[PDB]
Amino acid sequence: VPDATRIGRATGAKAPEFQELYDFDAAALTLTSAVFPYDSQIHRAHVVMLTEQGILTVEESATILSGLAQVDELAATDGSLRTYLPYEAALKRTIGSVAGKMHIGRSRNDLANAGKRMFLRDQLLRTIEAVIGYREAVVHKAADHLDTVMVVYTQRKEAQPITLGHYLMAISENLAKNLDRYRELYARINLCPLGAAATAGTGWPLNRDRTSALLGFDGLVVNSIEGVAGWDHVAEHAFVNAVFLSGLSRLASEIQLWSTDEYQVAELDASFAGTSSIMPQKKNPDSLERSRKAAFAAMGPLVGILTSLNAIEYQYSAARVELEPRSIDALIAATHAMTGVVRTLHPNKERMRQYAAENYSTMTDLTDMLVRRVGIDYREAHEIVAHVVITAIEKGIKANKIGLDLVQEAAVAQTGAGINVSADDIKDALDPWQNVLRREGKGMPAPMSVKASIDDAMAELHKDRAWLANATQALANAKQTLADSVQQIIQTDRKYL
Amino acid sequence: VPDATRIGRATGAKAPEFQELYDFDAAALTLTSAVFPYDSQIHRAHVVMLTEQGILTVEESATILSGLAQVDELAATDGSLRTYLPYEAALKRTIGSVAGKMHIGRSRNDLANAGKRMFLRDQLLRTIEAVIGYREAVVHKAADHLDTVMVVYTQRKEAQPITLGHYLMAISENLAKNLDRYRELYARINLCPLGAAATAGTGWPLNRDRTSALLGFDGLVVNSIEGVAGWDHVAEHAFVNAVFLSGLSRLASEIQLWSTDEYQVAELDASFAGTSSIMPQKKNPDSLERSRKAAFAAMGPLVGILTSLNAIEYQYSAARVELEPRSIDALIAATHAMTGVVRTLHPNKERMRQYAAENYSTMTDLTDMLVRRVGIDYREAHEIVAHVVITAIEKGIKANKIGLDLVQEAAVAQTGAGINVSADDIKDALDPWQNVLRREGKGMPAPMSVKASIDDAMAELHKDRAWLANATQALANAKQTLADSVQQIIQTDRKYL
Amino acid sequence: VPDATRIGRATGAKAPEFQELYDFDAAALTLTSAVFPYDSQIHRAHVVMLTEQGILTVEESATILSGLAQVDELAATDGSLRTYLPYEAALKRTIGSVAGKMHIGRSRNDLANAGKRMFLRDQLLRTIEAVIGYREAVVHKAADHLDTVMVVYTQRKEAQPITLGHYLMAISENLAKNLDRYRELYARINLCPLGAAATAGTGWPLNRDRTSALLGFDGLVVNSIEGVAGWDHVAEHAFVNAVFLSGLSRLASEIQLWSTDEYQVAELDASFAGTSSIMPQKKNPDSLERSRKAAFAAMGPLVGILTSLNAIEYQYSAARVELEPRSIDALIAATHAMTGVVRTLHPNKERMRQYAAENYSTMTDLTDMLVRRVGIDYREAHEIVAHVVITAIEKGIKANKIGLDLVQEAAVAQTGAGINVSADDIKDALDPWQNVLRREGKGMPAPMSVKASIDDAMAELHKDRAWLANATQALANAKQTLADSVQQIIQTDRKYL
Amino acid sequence: VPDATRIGRATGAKAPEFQELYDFDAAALTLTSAVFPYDSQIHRAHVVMLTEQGILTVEESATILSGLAQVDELAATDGSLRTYLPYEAALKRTIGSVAGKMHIGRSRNDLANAGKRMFLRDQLLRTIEAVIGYREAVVHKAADHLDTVMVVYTQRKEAQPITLGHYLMAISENLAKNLDRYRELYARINLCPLGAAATAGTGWPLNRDRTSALLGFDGLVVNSIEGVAGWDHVAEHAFVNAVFLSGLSRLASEIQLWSTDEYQVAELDASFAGTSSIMPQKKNPDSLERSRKAAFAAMGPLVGILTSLNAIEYQYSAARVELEPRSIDALIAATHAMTGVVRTLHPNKERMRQYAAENYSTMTDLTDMLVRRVGIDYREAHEIVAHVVITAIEKGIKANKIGLDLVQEAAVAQTGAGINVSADDIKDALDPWQNVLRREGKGMPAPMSVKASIDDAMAELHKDRAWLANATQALANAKQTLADSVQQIIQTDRKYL
Ligand SMILES: O=C(O)/C=C/C(=O)O
Ligand SMILES: O=C(O)/C=C/C(=O)O
Ligand SMILES: O=C(O)/C=C/C(=O)O
Ligand SMILES: O=C(O)/C=C/C(=O)O
């Protein structure tokens, strides 16, 4: 059975990244099912620490640890075992009364806070990975379009000539700062609240540092109230998602206008567009609009979470709103979709140049030339060139057809006086590519300036990947260190007891 | 004329911090009037750079710079001159046509982005200052209440014994992370977009680094589109305000419950409470409720800003929502009010202790003691002690009156078997102060543990103040460097030209 | 296997309404799966109308209609068939090329708008039913507590004496107005956009009224753009949900304070409370806090939907955010939970009376008595009684122990003059039940006044149920009328063709 | 001094409605100053009722009423007198101790709730007036453009031919339903809470109906708790503002795309456009973007209000967020601005027609013609015409140049078979005006169908104005009835006492 939406102008298959936008909602896990595997890691790390602190015997610990493996497999198909007390009771039915001792010095409150942090932690690295891939495609695309002259817009009106590469590097700088936000957030998510128990700690002599290290945390949530009442990292995760996706909506919207039947300065790759069930001419920006949809929806969790925090005391509370898997899955799908949109975008270079040459985005350079050549102030030069545009539009004269006669008329009609410039000055001022070349300072569209920004971004991207690789490897090491400690307890018991 | 609200139980005057909550709304500036002084600084810094780049003659520059001082004073009483083009036109009427040259290589777009950043920058240091003062009062208050035994709550139910000092250090840790958020934000606000002009830079050879340095920025917004389209720092400023104030609402709510007629474990200082026009018995938490009001209201700008970014392209746009002075003023007023609330709070130490001793928050330690002494698992010990509580409540027996007989009954009724513990074990387990002393690990309420957290917080507070002092001094130095460069141009012209 | 959370003080099973709060998230349908059955109703109603308009032959219509039944059953187990074009293609594979004719004069745009309206329509009647059951329990509970004297609070401080019945009838009036909001919304949801096709209608001679009537709509969305671009009913549905649940959060919060260990003026029924895995004394308000959680979360869809509308043009758009089943399911679960909370709530009548008599909520009546008996203005009487309270608190004198001596002292100390009232006047003024009886105007807590409000509410509830019964029956009639028309076409073909 | 922004292409003056967008922020009142005049009306109405109930003597009443006039005039220049207790104290200093008796049976709680309702009530009629003027301009504009053929868009892609009049009547239907929302809200705002006093009523025998009638309310908020705790009408006012403005943003956005340099199918009137300080060619949609800005900002109050309600109990609370004058003023300014935008919009009729004829929006009619003429199913006809478009685009053939040859090729290439249609069938199918004429059902763009919608809208507008006139006159009558009752008391005292 084929994809029934790939009819008419919707040729070929959906790009896989495009298809993600349609699949994440039905495939998303509940928070309970997403967090459960991390809870079972906490059970092991907590039991190991209890053993090392002499609170559990090795026999007790080994019996518990082996039971966890059994119940975990039961919970793979029995969802009722994915919350704590049902899980603890199933462990009791599996290994006996000793199961109850794994909760010594512990509560559902610090267990849940820690487990949710571990889930958000992995999802944050997953997000940073996707955002890096987004930035990579943006920069790589820019490197191929240093000569792609086109107009930049302000207030949805043509402003001045730039290049497509110059535009994309604005997105690169946006993404660099959102990656900073995410990395800054990671340092606050990756703190271990275990040891706070209900909210006040415990009399049992826990080693909170050992539990934290075994679970991959880089530090503690120290105060025990903050350990269970702390929720700002959840709100912040929701916010960075929201603000990052607002910039993704803006690019999607920008490309959607580029790809209107009226602009026709860019076209979506067939693999990122759909069509209509009724209108055969439609090549619809489904990828862009469903990406924006996800950006709008990300407003919801942010408001729900902050509302819930505004509604309570500084306590553990079951009334706090969560950041759910389906919200994060939507962000990833949208980020992947726009990664592919950018990679496969087809700019219409000729029409881009045509607009730059014909639709008066070069008038600023004409104004600047008057100021530079004859020394009038900018406001006076501005009034003259404005008159040029008004007259040119009235007469149907494209910007690249503006000449000495029209400029002299405007100056006379506006000041009563001619103005001392040549037809070559005017010609050079109205050449959109010369407009680009002259804008060669930092962050400006001249190829050498955009090229420099690309070089800096490629260096920053290397550091982005390095930060991600180190954070990921640190978690993998701790997770392996924990698995080793678990088997060693089990082997010690099997061998000597 | 006296404060007519200070009647009956509302004795004395409002604390000044309390009064701030009533004054900020009517006293708040428009964004235009708040940003205008920074725009005039930009005019000077931009003109200086134009002069150093040989774009303006010294005569032109000096004439402009002296005119700015004149128009600035006019704008002190003529609000119509607080937007750019009216200001430029007034400068033209004051010094002549040369006024128009101060806009060379510049736009309202990068002028406004930079000016708003300078405003938010100062307001961010103002906020960091206030939050530091908030944390100082919280830590200083904690240092005086290491022995103030009281219950901590979870889900608005008494949980376990702690101390007031232990609770306040949860707030200290919350504020430390919000100070990190604010400092992280500062690095993104303190970037200079000047030189982007409309959105694509300019052909004029500007020195963007010089303009940035003269205005106190620590770096550039490089890409010219990002310079004018960039708005994420505004959304982020709104967010940190929102999440920080949500924690302030939670403390306000916590104290409001403490100070209910039913809890009576704390009382507001008369200078932070009001009364009713009809009910003479009322001592109302006006300070707390208007502080929460400001926290709820801070949700608004965050949503408005993010909505506006989700609604546009990655362009300069006049449709973007701003963070306004009155919102920031509300945060400061609430932060100052809660600073004073915490400083002057009157805890009722005797009733705090009474609840800890009588209302069963010590049952966990009783449970832990069974596990420790006889070795039963925690779940079984938990069921027994639960039976103790049920029976004690039925019989009207306060927790500190629970003895050997009642514990043995519960064990028998629940397991058919007695349990091997002494009356001294039970007595020690139900002593709320011993509950506190036993919780002596990291972040737990034992005095030595809270004392350690205070010591660390005092060290962190020293670094908070140091970061603030350095950031503030850097702006003062640049502002003085700019004033010097302005006079030197004016003096050079007066002397030689 | 038993409910492992029902341990210790969590006796018995969860009330079913309580359990709903734990089940709705994992059980919720996607919007696609929830809307799909309504789409298949639209296919039938649209085909019937095409037949009656002579666009389809009876043979064609009968073949299509019988195929719909076959594909519907396939889609019961094949989720891929729950969007239109896969469904249309499966119908094609089932009955042949004629399947494509069911889309004549139609689009996915007006099909989806109509199908989602039908879904929200049924969910709105479901919500109105639940809210009615909520109000019924509130009023019925009030009828049993006309004598249950207790204090009302303002700003979380005891204010004046009322009754529990009086408080609950405030909730009844709140719910009456939310039922008006919902009924007003229903009239805007129950409009049929079918016939708009893509956005501009069609050349085919459709009978839009017939399609609308067959699907239970009470009218048309006339303009074809509004038919597909119209989305305000979705935003409004989200809003009424949000504001209704904010009042439910406020009642939940009110009861949670009542049931604190410090108030102890009400207690949750065991079937609506939980306990702690660590603290055996906990009787936790899980029902209340998860109900508030749902109220906070309802903020999310409202913001997401409105953001998406603010982000587009007045067009059909795939970027619009939806109101999803899981959000509505959460509201129902919370409404059912609070319905049972109210029904089974255990007020502590004796302690309610004690607070009313002892904690100075009667001071207003004492003030009013001075004004009435000696004729002083209210502000002067207020200052005297305030002095009474201050002195009584200082001396540890409960309000019901205030006598002639203390009142005369305050008057002297405050005015230098005694005051002409008797000890019987004071006694009557400080009697909390007399406070209630004297408040006998409209909407006041006196039994006869609350009884009147109950009578009016019982009459309004009869009209609520009548409106719901009529709306529900109208849909059932249209749905049966449609099923009949479908079989008749099928029978006509089988018999004559 | 001229408007310095009216330079270059920004010719003439701003339209006054355009200028409103720049003035409302600095001119907006605080809520305190906006509500104060209504509070003084309440003082009079409450005193009158106290007199009629025999609680005040005529001498007392007359002395108070005359003092109110004096203090009101003082408060015109002394803002400190615009809150109750300062006002009451100034009245005391003016007429003596008797001033305190105006507060008998009353609180700041029900005074403030009622006063804010009266303010929102007037602002709601002001809003309904503005929205009516908005709808009038939309319908009147539509009546002049029944022949203005143009394409409608879906997903920002050309869809099918319509007319400008047809598009505007979608807005008319949107506004009709928002007027229903506002009128429905009015019935809930226009309820009087006076008589609730603090929250529990009073022992004084007030006539709540008389006070309500004197102040223009159409009924009571009955229950006294609901009278002071009730806030849903504030949230609802914020919501209708938000959803109404979201539709205004969508029209603004739609027109902004129409007026891009690339569409060029409409142009703003010079009086609703601005220009750039740097780019002389700019004709900027400042009116549209600042209108959308106000729509985004309206999200803020809605979220702040609902958050505050979610944060409290069902009590009077000072923590509740308000709907402020500046938010309402922004809506009015945006509504007035878009009223003028629509009135003065310059459609480019020739280019509108050109797009309709050339850019393939007529392909649906071509598809429908195949189905109608040869009887193939719609999906097969759709695939053929899709092939026509693909081939036509490849060959650069405008839609109106598609002929018999190209259609036969597509049919052959796609089915191997020709198709039995004439060149005249194709020609008629591709004629965009015939596309419009054929869409003649209800709500479709055919002139006779749009004309009918206009006739119905003109009838509905007459009823809109009639509802507004009646509501306004009812308030004017009550306000005059109150002024008369005040003088009569004053005259009775002056004459006989
Ligand atoms: O699939 C449809 O029926 C319409 C799609 C569109 O609006 O382009
Ligand atoms: O000032 C009043 O009238 C009431 C205050 C309160 O509710 O406590
Ligand atoms: O279930 C727990 O571990 C704690 C519950 C509570 O905070 O009361
Ligand atoms: O006024 C300016 O400087 C730029 C305006 C624009 O972006 O069009």
What would CATH call the homologous superfamily of the domain at 352-438 in chain A? Fumarase/aspartase (C-terminal domain)
How would you describe the shape of chain A? elongated
Write down the CATH class of the domain at 352-438 in chain A: Mainly Alpha
Helical content class of chain A: 55-70%
The main sheet of chain A comes to: 2 strands, antiparallel
What series of H and E elements makes up the topology of chain A? HHHHHEEHHHHEHHHEHHHHHHH
What is the end-to-end distance of chain A?
Answer: 60 Å
For the largest interface, the chains and their residue counts are:
A-B, 107 and 107 residues
Number of helices of chain A: 19
- CATH architecture classification of the domain at 352-438 in chain A: Orthogonal Bundle
Q: Which structural class fits the helix and strand makeup of chain A?
A: mainly alpha
Query: What's the quaternary structure here?
Result: homotetramer
| Strand content range of chain A | under 5%
CATH topology call of the domain at 352-438 in chain A: Ribonucleotide Reductase Protein R1, domain 1
Question: What is the radius of gyration of chain A computed over CA atoms, rounded to a whole number of angstroms?
Answer: 31 Å
Strand order of the largest sheet of chain A: 1-2
- The beta-strand count of chain A equals 4
Provide the list of bound ligands, each named once.
fumaric acid
